[PDB]
Design a protein around this nucleic acid. Sequence first.
DNA 1: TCAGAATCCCGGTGCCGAGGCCGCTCAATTGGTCGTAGACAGCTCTAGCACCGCTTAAACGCACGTACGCGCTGTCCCCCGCGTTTTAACCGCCAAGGGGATTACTCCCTAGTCTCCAGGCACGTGTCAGATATATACATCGAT
DNA 2: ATCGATGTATATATCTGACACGTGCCTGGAGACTAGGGAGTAATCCCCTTGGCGGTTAAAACGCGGGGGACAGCGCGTACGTGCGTTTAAGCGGTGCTAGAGCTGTCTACGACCAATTGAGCGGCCTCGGCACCGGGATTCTGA
Lengths: 97, 97, 83, 78, 283, 94, 93, 103, 105
Amino acid sequence: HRYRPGTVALREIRRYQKSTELLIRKLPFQRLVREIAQDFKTDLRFQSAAIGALQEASEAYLVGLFEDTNLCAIHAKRVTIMPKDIQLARRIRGERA
Amino acid sequence: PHRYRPGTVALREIRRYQKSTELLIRKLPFQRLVREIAQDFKTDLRFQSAAIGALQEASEAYLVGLFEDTNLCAIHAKRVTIMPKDIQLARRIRGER
Amino acid sequence: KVLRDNIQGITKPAIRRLARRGGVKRISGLIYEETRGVLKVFLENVIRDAVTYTEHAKRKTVTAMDVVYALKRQGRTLYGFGG
Amino acid sequence: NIQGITKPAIRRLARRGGVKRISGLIYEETRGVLKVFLENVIRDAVTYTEHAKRKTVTAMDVVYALKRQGRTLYGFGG
Amino acid sequence: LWASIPCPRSELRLDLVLPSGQSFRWREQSPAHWSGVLADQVWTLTQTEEQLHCTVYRSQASRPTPDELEAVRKYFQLDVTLAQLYHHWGSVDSHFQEVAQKFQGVRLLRQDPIECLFSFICSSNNNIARITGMVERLCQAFGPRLYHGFPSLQALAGPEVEAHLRKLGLGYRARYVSASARAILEEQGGLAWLQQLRESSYEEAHKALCILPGVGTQVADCICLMALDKPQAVPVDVHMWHIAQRDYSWHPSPQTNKELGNFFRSLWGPYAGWAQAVLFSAD
Amino acid sequence: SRKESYSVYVYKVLKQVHPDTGISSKAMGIMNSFVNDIFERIAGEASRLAHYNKRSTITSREIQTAVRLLLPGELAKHAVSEGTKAVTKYTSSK
Amino acid sequence: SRKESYSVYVYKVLKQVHPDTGISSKAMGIMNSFVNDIFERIAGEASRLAHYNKRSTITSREIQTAVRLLLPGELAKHAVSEGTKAVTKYTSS
Amino acid sequence: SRSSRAGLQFPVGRVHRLLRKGNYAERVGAGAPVYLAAVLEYLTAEILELAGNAARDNKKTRIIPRHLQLAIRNDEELNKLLGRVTIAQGGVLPNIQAVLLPK
Amino acid sequence: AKSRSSRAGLQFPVGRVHRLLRKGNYAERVGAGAPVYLAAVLEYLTAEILELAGNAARDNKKTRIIPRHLQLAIRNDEELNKLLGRVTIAQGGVLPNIQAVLLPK
DNA sequence: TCAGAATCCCGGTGCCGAGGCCGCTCAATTGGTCGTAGACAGCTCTAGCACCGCTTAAACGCACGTACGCGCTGTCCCCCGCGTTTTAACCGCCAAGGGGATTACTCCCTAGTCTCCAGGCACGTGTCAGATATATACATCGAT
DNA sequence: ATCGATGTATATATCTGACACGTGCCTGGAGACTAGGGAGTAATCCCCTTGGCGGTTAAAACGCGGGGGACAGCGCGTACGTGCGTTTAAGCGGTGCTAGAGCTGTCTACGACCAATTGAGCGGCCTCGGCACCGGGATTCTGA
């Protein structure tokens, strides 16, 4: 058979809300963190726990941001989120002027 | 005998109340409101005039900010009228209850 | 002196003026009750802390500094009235 | 390396948030948002490390940077 | 005491076949001398090279009688020359070639269809040791003390005493057992019905068996393979499926299991079932 | 070196409330950080109260009003009740 | 009793920048409260830094780091430069 | 000891020392550490009770950050107290908008 | 010169800031340079805000700074507005801003 | 309907908090001894509350019209689902050395204290920046 | 488009009270001296962060079908806006009383600080029992 569109999305949501592991790959995020850091100060060192905490904070922030942008999209009577939704969410939350 | 089309006077009013800076809620009703609220916490309190002034100023500022966020949501939903669902969305996204 | 029903003292045109200062051009009919409820909740939250501050100092008069501190601790710092 | 935040990873993050259907440009928007957030946190963390004259960004520095951002984090220190 | 009956060891490895999960009333009592009840009496099973051994109880115990001997041998189905089949299987299947050149003497046996059905009902998602203990408990709890025997078709159920079976460790299988025991009585013809399935075509017996509660594709396959005399049947147990994965595969669901069984039958020919057992007891 | 933590006392409370239950190290760390955070909140609020009222000391009263300020309604009431109970019992045996 | 504020100095700077401009009483009060709030923020951040580093004395470096943490963008740079200039001039005599 | 006298389980001495060295005020009354320790002990007991209940719901005997997150977010009071804090390995509360469900 | 403010070249009260640092109970000890640094920072920020506010007042033809001008200067600037983004200025008003979609056709 | 989840229990992993001894810090107690913070008693007089009359700006109620919010239909394109190919993440393990923490020592900077005195605060005064009021010239919206 | 009504910004003039300025003085800031310990500096240690290699394999990347969700048009009817007349009560200015906010005097009960004592608690293995998960001769249940 072939699952109708949107039905696997629901099971994916249930799967990723019941579990608690990390979603972003560890090495790419660590590399991104170092690439951003080297701008402010060269040859920095990072404790493993420091990067773990950074990843956890970033994932929590992004999950909250998506929860809000999903609320925005539903409010506009849409089901698909679009960049205007994220812009609205950040603007309301005070992260943009 | 004249009549302006809908929204023209609303725009003039917006310009007026964004150019001036006086208070917008009548004073005595707000004083009575704060005293009424206060009754539930401690009996027969006495309020400094400056205390009620500060309360009113903060309340009006908060409501104006809330209405700006509500207008943002209403525009985002392709509407021009603000509705209770817009205020609820703004409150929810702001983190308020 | 007992008080009651003064919440309605926040009149409809007052809500309209507040919205206009927010840039809203067209307003629904149901917005007013929601706005009054929101204002009541916010006032309760602020005045509870103000009254607590007044009680701590053994005073009976809620001073402006109590309101300013209550607002400041709520992440709504206020300028011009004290502190 | 911002392009290293893979499309399926952003999809998984959105799924955990309860999103059902995702537009094409949401990926670029999310990458921009994440870059801004990481820059904001990392600047404060690096400031803390420079203040202590260290060169190793300690977990406590990240925790303090997040706490000052009003985004307190539990599980790494205090 | 000591008894013997001619059959070569290559025809049957009585030392190894019995605990291979076909019947669960067999467990050691004397070294290399398995004990178990069949035909409402106790037997001891071992084997020598040029003959087998099978002795019975009588204190005046010396040897078994011809009728009991033939009943038990028929249970073993020893009247088929199993050894030669390696000549056809090594050359028809590449992996069974390696199995055949490794070890020899694995066949199927014929217990009662009721015992087969209930034992494999207890075997759903379970290990052989636990199924053995569970059967020993269920028989002791309900069936007569003959080692305790299988109960009657009606006596396997009762006035909502089905909660009793759960006390034996039967778990969720108690509902299966109770429902199937009530059904075989109230909508089927008991022992004559079961014999009918022994004298019904492969696909008809398959469909008839699958209709009762507590028995699925794999349990029905096992009942067809043994105690109902359907040698073409190739049950797909977890060991079979894993061996298929590590031997050869092309594509689990009911359709996939159907295709797997069809291909296995196409490979090992009419006597596929007996071949499966050899492959099965390799692990 | 020697690191101070609440991992002992938090466990003592746990077995007082849920005798059977246990706690993992990760959750013990969460609990320790949570206790530190609330202690810092309450102490900071009490310090600000004392500074506002020109008082040099922070006493049971400052802690009580700080608890009433920080915690929500029911939690604040129960915390105040328990704090008053503890202070009265402690001073009952000077 | 005797009260004190920054109203004298806030006016001193004003005259230095815009000699002809005046300031109303309410604006002066807002400026005074702004100065108090900024002072409180910087002092609190410096205190927390000192506590984090186990050090007991608030030095100039603590103020500099607190300013770097609190002030955004070009304000951080300019304020740090002004503070360093003031400290150097003070130490020079 | 002072912990025993007040009937509390938390350390009154450590709380007093932290109130002292923390530089919160010039002086620290005797009653402050006892009150503060009592409050901390109460809050810890409450959150641990809720976490243990959540763990029992999941058929687990150990409290893990997932259970702490569930206890914190499912309780209307703690949620307000700890709204802004994020808990490592906490996950999120299962919640799917009704509009997204199939017809 | 006696006063520390004169020595540092500042206009703000170095001595008063030192007192507040000590009496405010921020730390056990206060460095000699901390009051000077803090006073200089506060003076720079005050000068910035008053420069912008005076610019706004001159734009409005008035000679006295009033809360409206402080509000305009603070909100129009892009970095002060981030420094004082959650601060209410009494008698402040709002920046003139009407959303594009709402403008008349 | 053909995929995914759940059911009972026994045994086997594998990790891992929980005592447990043990040794030992060090800091938490116990007991004294002082200095002063503030609790209490008063006393002053600010300002908060109550009420009273008057004016008029603001709020209310209602009428009429139109524009926009909602619903419905149609198009069409672009995200989801699926399969196949690709790549680099992760896991394990091993090496090098950078720097974060410790310890000891030293000295110079801040705290504490005691004299003076002048800079800012309180009060009083003058005057000009702006609020009010009258006059009107241009702008924008709506009808035509 | 053009013309008319209403609104807005701009001119000019008067009066006032809010802010700039001046004067007195007192208390808090500055100068001078002692001291002691907090911070700076040098050496040492070891651990933990960076770096590398090989494989395996899980996840990412890419391509394609097409299903449905986004988006655009259109219609309509009623909810909202604008305007007018009517009614409420907020704002202003006075008059009067007194609760209590703010300050002063004191003296004692409390907390800071010290010395001498010990056990509560921290770090280190060790031995667990115990917890969590998987897997077993699948079938049934549930939803797409």
